[PDB]
Amino acid sequence: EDKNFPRTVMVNLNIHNRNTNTSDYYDRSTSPWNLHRNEDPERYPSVIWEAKCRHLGCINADGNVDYHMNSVPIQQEILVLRREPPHSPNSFRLEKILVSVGCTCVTPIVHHVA
């Protein structure tokens, strides 16, 4: 019932493409990463690309694992819809979730004493 909880609102359904209609970086990066199937038919989007750092260090020009650098993950908070009630394709409820998007290579923290 609407008006019982004012948090229930109508949504257009036809997504407004913010030029999403108008990569191979995971394997080419010096801090590469692998994608995992964090899939769920109840959550929108159904398929997710969980990216966690493949190498602990960073790969140099020769292909060696260079321990003078560290690969670090990049996480974000994104909004998703989850069915409410379950299996009913008419209504949903918002959710904020943690996702691992990609990796980058960083110089370590050092404390130089003579």
């Binding site: 997504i15 493409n17 191979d24 929108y44 159904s46 069915r83 394709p89």
Partner: protein, 422 residues
């Protein structure tokens, strides 16, 4: 039908039946296997045709065209239905909203009702896409048609995609005493330029690197030009593709510069090396230079032409060195180097005569002297009228005076002193 579809997104089903498309990336999810209280449509299989899109003359991209066949099943005469194509594939995520309306004529229970075609699912090269097709509302589970796409490796892929080889033209120009790098980029097009000397280990060896706003016709210096010279260009945009062109591999002027820059260096008495920028294999052998004149006579026979390789260390089969021994390097027999290694170690050039020993008939020793006009087997009659100064060198040799330079089971070389005759 064609492999050159237009820039617009529109549907075109099989004849007879009418249909529409709402390409608004609608929210799509499975839901539940609902009941069918009447004739309802359902998919049978999925297809993936090779189609290309071109917005303008100089701008073309891919279009993985998909098709879904439908059929009447379940428990006005025009049968209506709503179909979805959830393309949850890498990199971008987009959905499609079809609207099939098969009329009464094609209505057959337990049989097909035509087909629907969407143009297009622009997928990147080298990405195993996921095509999940299911009815709206859902009846059958999403049909799996996980298509494996070719990278920039398909035969027809090279014929259309500009990423494959087509990169701003750098025309080869070894005209006159100036080597020109003619560029065909636009006036406002920026780019990165790098020139380097490739080889076996440690491929990168840059000579010049710079950012430029072309088209500039860059004139190269013959100091940095050799057969190893390779060019790499790329537009100033992140992740832009490059190409490594190594054309000087068999250029005459490049090989001429390579040898004039290459040098020979003695490491130790029994070790030497060929130091050249471009590692190109070639042969070499020991030679005997006269102190007076300079017609260097090769010592083949009795010595052998060694298989030399740049940066590969070689050893001499000599007991000791001699200033008159000079190494000769040739590629395709044409002579390139005649540097005398022992000119600093034991030089200058000594006028000590060289002998070539070999076992003559009846097991006896048979000697010979290296003259400007070949060799003269002595003891013998001489051009000096008398039995030659070789008669006295013959005594010096058996009395242990002569210096043994090379030793072999079949022969030997000796440096005899002539400093007691003039």
């Amino acid at each position: 039908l064609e492999r050159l579809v237009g820039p617009q997104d529109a549907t075109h089903c099989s004849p007879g039946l009418s249909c529409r498309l709402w390409d608004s990336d609608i929210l799509c999810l499975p839901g539940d296997i609902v009941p069918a209280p009447g004739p309802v449509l359902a998919p049978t299989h999925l297809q993936t045709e090779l189609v290309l899109r071109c917005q303008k003359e100089t701008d073309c991209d891919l279009c993985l065209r998909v098709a879904v066949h439908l059929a009447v099943h379940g428990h006005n005469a025009s049968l209506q239905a709503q179909v979805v194509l959830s393309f949850q594939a890498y990199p971008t995520a987009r959905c499609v909203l079809l609207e099939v309306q098969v009329p009464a004529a094609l209505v057959q229970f337990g049989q097909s009702v035509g087909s629907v075609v969407y143009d297009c699912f622009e997928a990147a090269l080298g990405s195993e896409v996921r095509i999940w097709s299911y009815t709206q509302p859902r009846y059958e589970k999403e049909l799996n048609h996980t298509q494996q796409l070719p990278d920039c490796r398909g035969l027809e892929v090279w014929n259309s995609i500009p990423s494959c080889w087509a990169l701003p033209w750098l025309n080869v120009s070894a005209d006159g005493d100036n080597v020109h790098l003619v560029l065909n980029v636009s006036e406002e097009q920026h780019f990165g330029l790098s020139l380097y000397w490739n080889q076996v280990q440690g491929p990168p060896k840059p000579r010049w690197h710079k950012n430029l706003t072309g088209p500039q016709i860059i004139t190269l210096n013959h100091t940095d030009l050799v057969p190893c010279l390779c060019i790499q260009v790329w537009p100033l945009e992140p992740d832009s593709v490059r190409t490594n062109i190594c054309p000087f591999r068999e250029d005459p002027r490049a090989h001429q510069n390579l040898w004039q820059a290459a040098r020979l260096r003695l490491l130790t008495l029994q070790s030497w090396l060929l130091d050249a920028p471009c590692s190109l294999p070639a042969e070499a052998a020991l030679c005997w230079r006269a102190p007076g004149g300079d017609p260097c006579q090769p010592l083949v026979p009795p010595l052998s032409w060694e298989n030399v390789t740049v940066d590969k260390v070689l050893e001499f089969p000599l007991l000791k060195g001699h200033p008159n021994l000079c190494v000769q390097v040739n590629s395709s027999e044409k002579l390139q180097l005649q540097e005398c290694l022992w000119a600093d170690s034991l030089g200058p050039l000594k006028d000590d005569v060289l002998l070539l020993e070999t076992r003559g008939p009846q097991d006896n020793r048979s000697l010979c002297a290296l003259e400007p006009s070949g060799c003269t087997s002595l003891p013998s009659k001489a051009s000096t009228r008398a039995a030659r100064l070789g008669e006295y060198l013959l005594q010096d040799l058996q009395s242990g005076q002569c210096l043994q330079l090379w030793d072999d089971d079949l022969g030997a070389l000796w440096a005899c002193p002539m400093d007691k005759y003039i």
